[PDB]
């Protein structure tokens, strides 16, 4: 199975607890610290040792994380480790962030461009995307010398190609055929 298929009910249980008890930012910081701690190489070598029990792996992760975990997050760590699902801990955190983006009505949008865009240009693209998607948007701008002009908007699976490289590929397909 995929990692998202296995990571779906843990993120849904954590999101339903954090929406029921008004602790959304606490669990988002806790799952971010837990994902980043579980991707470090020394902790990953410790979590693959065969002589350790699952309770000692959960106790080592709780003792490493410390003050960034409240008591239901520690209960969540013991439930994840008892079902042998600790390698899912980045994917769980990512799916939690997706659920929180549907709850606060926001979408994370990546915009790539040929030259640097100013704040007026980002506010203009963000307002057009907020009118189209009916969500508060958050733009993340980046550069690319492969484009000769224009922008490329990526929002989830939605791709809007306004670059002239794509218009050059359309003209090449229109004159080749």
């Amino acid at each position: 199975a995929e990692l998202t298929t296995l990571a779906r009910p843990y993120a849904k249980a954590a999101f339903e607890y954090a929406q029921a008890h008004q602790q959304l930012a606490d669990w988002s910081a806790a799952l971010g610290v837990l994902a980043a701690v579980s991707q470090d190489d020394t902790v990953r070598q410790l979590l693959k040792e065969p002589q350790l029990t699952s309770s000692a792996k959960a106790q080592s992760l709780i003792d490493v994380c410390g003050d960034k975990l409240n008591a239901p997050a520690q209960n969540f760590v013991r439930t994840v480790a008892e079902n042998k699902r600790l390698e899912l801990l980045p994917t769980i955190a990512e799916m939690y962030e997706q659920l929180k983006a549907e709850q606060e009505k926001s979408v994370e949008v990546e915009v790539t461009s040929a030259f640097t865009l100013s704040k007026e240009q980002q506010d203009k693209l963000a307002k057009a995307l907020s009118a189209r998607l009916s969500r508060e948007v958050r733009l993340h701008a980046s550069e690319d010398a492969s484009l000769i002009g224009g922008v490329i908007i990526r929002a989830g699976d939605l791709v809007i190609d306004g670059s002239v490289r794509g218009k050059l590929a359309k003209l090449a397909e229109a004159l080749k055929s």
Binding site: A36, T42, Q45, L46, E49, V64, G66, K68
Partner: peptide
Amino acid sequence: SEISEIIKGRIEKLDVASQA
């Protein structure tokens, strides 16, 4: 990275065997 300094200092004192 987003790992804090105190959490890194807790990571460096872990009992990890050196697997030959």
